[PDB]
Amino acid sequence: THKPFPAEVSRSIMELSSVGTLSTLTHDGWPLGVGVRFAVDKDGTPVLCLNRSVSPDKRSALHVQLEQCGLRTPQCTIQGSIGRDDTVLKRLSATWREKFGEEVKEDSLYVVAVDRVLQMEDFMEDGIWVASSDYKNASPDPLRDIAEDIVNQINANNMEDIFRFCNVYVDLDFVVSETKMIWMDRLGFDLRVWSPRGVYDVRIPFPMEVTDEKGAKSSFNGMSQLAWEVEKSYCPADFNKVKLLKQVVG
Amino acid sequence: THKPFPAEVSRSIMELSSVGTLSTLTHDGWPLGVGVRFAVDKDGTPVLCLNRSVSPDKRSALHVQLEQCGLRTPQCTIQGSIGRPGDDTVLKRLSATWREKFGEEVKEDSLYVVAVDRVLQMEDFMEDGIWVASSDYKNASPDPLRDIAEDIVNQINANNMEDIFRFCNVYVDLDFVVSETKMIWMDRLGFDLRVWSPRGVYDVRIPFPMEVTDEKGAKSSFNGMSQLAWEVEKSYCPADFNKVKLLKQV
Amino acid sequence: EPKKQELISKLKTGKTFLRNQEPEKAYTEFKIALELAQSLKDPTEEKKAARGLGASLQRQGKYREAIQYHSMVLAISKRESEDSGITEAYGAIADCYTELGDLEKAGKFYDTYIARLET
Amino acid sequence: KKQELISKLKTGKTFLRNQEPEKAYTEFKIALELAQSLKDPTEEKKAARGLGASLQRQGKYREAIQYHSMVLAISKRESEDSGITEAYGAIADCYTELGDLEKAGKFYDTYIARLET
Amino acid sequence: RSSIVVIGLSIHTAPVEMREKLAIPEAEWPRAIAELCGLNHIEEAAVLSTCNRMEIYVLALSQHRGVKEVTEWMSKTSGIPVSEICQHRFLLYNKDATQHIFEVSAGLDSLVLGEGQILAQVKQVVKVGQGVNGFGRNISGLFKHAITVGKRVRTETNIASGAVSVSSAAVELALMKLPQSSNVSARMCVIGAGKMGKLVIKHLMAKGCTKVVVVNRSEERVSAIREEMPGIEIIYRPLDEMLACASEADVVFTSTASETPLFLKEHVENLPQASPEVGGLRHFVDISVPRNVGSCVGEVETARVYNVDDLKEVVEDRMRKAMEAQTIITEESTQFEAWRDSLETVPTIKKLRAYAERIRVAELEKCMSKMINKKTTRAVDDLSRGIVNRFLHGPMQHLRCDGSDSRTLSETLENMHALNRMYGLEK
Amino acid sequence: RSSIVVIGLSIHTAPVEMREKLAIPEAEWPRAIAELCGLNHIEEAAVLSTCNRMEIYVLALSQHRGVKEVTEWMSKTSGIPVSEICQHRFLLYNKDATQHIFEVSAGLDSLVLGEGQILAQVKQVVKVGQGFGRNISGLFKHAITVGKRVRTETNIASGAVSVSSAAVELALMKLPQVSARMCVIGAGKMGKLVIKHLMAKGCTKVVVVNRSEERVSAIREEMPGIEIIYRPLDEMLACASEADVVFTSTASTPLFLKEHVENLPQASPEVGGLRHFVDISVPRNVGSCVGEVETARVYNVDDLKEVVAKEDRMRKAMEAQTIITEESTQFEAWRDSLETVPTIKKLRAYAERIRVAELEKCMSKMDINKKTTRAVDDLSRGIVNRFLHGPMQHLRCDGSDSRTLSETLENMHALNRMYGLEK
């Protein structure tokens, strides 16, 4: 496909979001879910603050969401064990404060040892499990902080190109009513197309991988130009259009 | 206090929000947390659409958050058992509420219900929280201002900073000078304010003279307090009442 | 020659008085100018003095009394079938209504005033 | 001959009224030839301002500036403040048609300072 | 900055024992408006007084000082201390003020009067304030449009069908409180056969009441009602037999226009107990403001009193009519305010003329001093006003917009701001 | 419609074997700008060509047609098909464009030129100023300001990996365990920094091949810490034969070929017997297949991305983005400052039609006399001037303040609405 690896998506989610649900066990044996703010180290292992003490079962699971343009919410769940030396404690107590800008009690600092990460693409999805090695090694997407800002700018200032991308880059069988842009990463970007028939999500790839903000804008301007030349008939559309769509329910 | 019962707040959260974390146990015995959309009946009992199965251990916990003006995030957690509705008339009752809440359709092969046994309730993160009996929860009613609370707050914070500042001088006995003050939330009994100052950051609860039942009731009550506060500061009338003293750090 | 020269004198004198904020001293000037204009049987000069009376009342806060005199210049113009000062009349009246706090009524008169600016 | 000046002077404005800049340009030339010959500073600026205006319609903006700059010279040579403000506007009008918004802006800034008095 | 304010005592915020002290009859309406406009920060005023509300709609210069002055007027007129009024005061500002008066005219704010008495009264207020200088145009404009909203809700939604009125709730409350053993078989009595009185008898009949005794001044009035509803037996008695009727009635409905009570404790004490079928309790339901029943007749063991405040008990899944009527209110409330914003450019239209005159006069005087005349003077004056008029016509025309089109209205106000910046009109 | 567009091939999107086909020498800069303006949708043009980028700055009426006309010109100047150019072209529009040239002048992007060569070239581009109108010149002139502003407020330049610097580093990344007999062909601005950054690594002796001997002797006395010996181009193939790694920087077609290196001895067994041809000169001097030789490997300027990457070079980077952001949004503020100018011209045009018509309708009712006509005309122009002065003054705005600029543009919008200046 043209989408980044699920291990990279989980890392991206962990870098952008700051609110998650800490699922744990009770003495009664019942599962319990509590909201909690969290931070992420350089490896990807989550760091959180609790008001409770370390119990006898240390195994827990941290579920984190990321809403994208209020259309799709990719989410992941770190499954592992939680527990409390001052070596790696002074380091994590600094990263937390650097993320939130707030003070932090070192008596309630916990670390969830990643065993595996479940990774979903949206709600009501199956998701693919990710090994703690593939997750630890994967790097967050380099366009994460600029994604929402660029996506929103495109949706308002280049709507002419978004509709035009639906005519020359994807092989659809219906008329376009409305089409907004959902997200954007190093490999490409997703679109949501509306029609009198129904609504789907398409993934249009970049010509080549993007590394920074200037690259994404340059890639978009290149695709916008070609898409314009095709519709205006100045050059042939010498490529295979995107055919893979995806059902969704709005 | 002048704040509504924890049994009522949880009902308010369940009515406003639509997204939660379903904490459940697996065959492995590990707690698993996945995001899930839900709806609420007249009793407060949550109904959700889940794609996972089964689990054979039906013990689960649904965690739901509610962010208020991006300052405070009250959250509750329903603990109980998940099972099919009954494959009868009580299924069509749920398919209608899901269709009325979201306006979308529903796959009925995926309709699960959490049998409420007890509910946890917290005012924000890192808070201990209070358990609520399923009898108190079912009997408690959602706040009559829930659907206008967010809108009415933003309108006050954007059109009524003069009155908000004035409330910090005549309604609360603060032992410092106020730098900034935003309005957090507003319910049937009153409203919460967050005061910023070099001394600290605290949340105060200023109660209405009497209980409010509607939108007109809240605006008339606010305008009444806004009037008195103005007459006091302008010294046209005396302040014959006891100022609020109780604060809360965050 | 003698009476006409007396008219123009007191006429511009009032405008001098209106130029600074002494309307009571101005109202007296146009009052004479109107009386002199009527005896001279000059419709053109009569509506000029009539306009001063209305303007002076506006400065005293006597807006409703001013409208009466601004309506006079309309009657003179309609009787003489000359469209000179009609555009100002509808505008002046709307100015008075604006100060009375009745903006809906004033707006309708301005609406007439705007249509005459064409002309 | 003095009657011939005003004759072709107002004649040129007629062609400018009916968008014929070529026939208008010729008339203001003759009008200038008479205005200089009669030695009247006021009449000279008239034909000169007329020439520049007639050139703007032909697209000859750069050439037009020269004649709009003459009326600035006539005024300074006569110590006269007449027709100067319209010149600064007319010159700035030309630069605006050349796509050069900074020189036009500076020449418009000067144009504002004169509208007062 | 002038704002439309509504101040007063609603049934939801002030008790009947407090509101009745401020109940202004139609006769004193012109006086009340006169006094209110006598205040400094009050320009226009109107008084809306029903059994559910005592509300004063005013047009104020300052919305803080204006309220203070009106609240003081309420105290000096009612005798109630200002502090005690503030603990029960109802207060809304502009867009919320116009929203409220519409919801009242549409009968959305429960309860209703029945048979369209609310709308009939608003017309009457407008009719009476036609001669009143205090009544202004801004208040008249609001009230007149409120009648439109009323007529729209009456015609576009049959919400009035199942709507609970004061009289309706009076019957419902009576059958509710008296023991479930034959709520109708109990002896009924109604004092005062006016608009409120007819609706009591009507709803009694609609619950199966076959016979009712009615006390009233004019017998012709009662006979006019009997000839209207043959489904119920109506017996007429004069006021002379009032206590005689109450003594033979299990429940007494009182509606009249008497400022002083018709029942005091002393008299009800002399009355026998009611039928043992209802427990010997005589239920005095009072739907009048001021009340017709004294406030200590309830102290009698064989007598219980109910005011309009007590009609709140169970006041119905057909509430879709309420939402359909809210469509009308929202449609007109957000359209009336747009019409008001249309008039904000009027003062700017005035200042712009004044700015133009100062220039036109000054330039003509410097022209006339540097200049035989006759027809030439009239021609140069025509040039002087001709240049100005055609120059102003542009901006002037684009300051005037009315006629909805929120987008054109938005541009119109931006035109004003620009004229303020360019010519320094407001500065 | 008008847009400032930057088009071209950067080191991050196109390989060196593709860019060198478009490396336009300084001599042909006026000709390149002349040809580009020969296009319909191109008013102004400029060419920025360094060893890491080929960029074309233009003033386009339509940007979709403007880019196309230029992309074709790039093909008609390189021989590379338009289809292939689009697969490697770099393209930013407006404030993304104005920022990019600022990020280049500040040495913020990619490997740097060194010794302010990057800033010196932009000054040189501006010095070559003939007909490159006032908008492109305006952008480049302001880029010089940003370039020197970053130079003086942030010495980020003193620790940045430069092309010549990375050439020395990459050389040590491929070479084992120096010393190890370095040789540099061509003694220029690049050649200097190659030796300079070579001396700072513990190099005892360096062989330098160059045309001018006087040029080399001037370099030896400036940096007395490393032994520098001179040999001319005649012994270029001989010096390379007595060196383990050859640095080539000149302004030449390739100097070393396939079978010219095959005839060369193997390198010392102390470094693995391999030769490193590091080519930082563009177009290249080595290539295009010399690496086919067993004892020789070629490294282009593209391979300099592999090394290096360590601390404050990202703190200084953020301190420069502060400078860039400041001047970039200040330059666009200056471009928006002139947007009201056409409106001012149209308002005079509107005011004149009324002033003329009312004066012409006046003289028809008035002939006599001499000094009166000049009095009735001054009145006519007196009312108009004092009426225009308000709006006119509030259309001309400059300096900063996001309020005065915002309010001025809204004034233009209103005058357009009120007087119907759109038509």
Author numbering:
A (entry chain D): 56 to 139, 142 to 307
B (entry chain C): 56 to 305
C (entry chain E): 198 to 316
D (entry chain F): 200 to 316
E (entry chain A): 94 to 408, 413 to 468, 472 to 527
F (entry chain B): 94 to 224, 228 to 273, 277 to 351, 353 to 409, 412 to 468, 471 to 527
Show me the paper's own sentences about this structure.
Then glutamyl-tRNA reductase (GluTR) reduces the tRNAGlu-bound glutamate to glutamate-l-semialdehyde (GSA) in an NADPH-dependent manner. Three mechanisms have been characterized for plant GluTR activity regulation, which are (i) the end-product feedback inhibition by heme4, (ii) repression by a membrane protein FLUORESCENT (FLU), and (iii) formation of complex with a soluble GluTR-binding protein (GBP). GluTR consists of three domains: an N-terminal catalytic domain, an NADPH-binding domain, and a C-terminal dimerization domain8. FLU directly interacts with GluTR’s dimerization domain through its tetratricopepetide-repeat (TPR) domain7910.
In the present study, we obtained the 2:2:2 FLUTPR-GluTR-GBP complex and solved its structure. A stable FLUTPR-GluTR-GBP ternary complex was obtained with excess amounts of GBP and FLUTPR. The ternary complex crystals belong to space group C2, while the GluTR-GBP binary complex crystals belong to P212121, and the FLUTPR-GluTRDD binary complex crystals belong to P6522. The structure of the ternary complex was determined by the molecular replacement method using template coordinates of GluTR-GBP and FLUTPR-GluTRDD, and refined to a resolution of 3.2 Å. The ternary complex resembles the shape of a merged structure of the two binary complexes. The positions of GluTR’s C-terminal region are quite different when the ternary complex and GluTR-GBP are superimposed. GBP and the remainder of GluTR have no significant change, except that the linker between NADPH-binding domain and the long “spinal” helix of GluTR cannot be traced in the ternary complex. Conversely, the linker between the two C-terminal helices of GluTR that is missing in GluTR-GBP or FLUTPR-GluTRDD can be observed in the ternary complex. Compared with FLUTPR-GluTRDD, there is an extra ionic bond between the catalytic domain of GluTR and the third TPR motif of FLUTPR. The two spinal helices in the ternary complex are almost identical, which is reminiscent of Methanopyrus kandleri GluTR8.
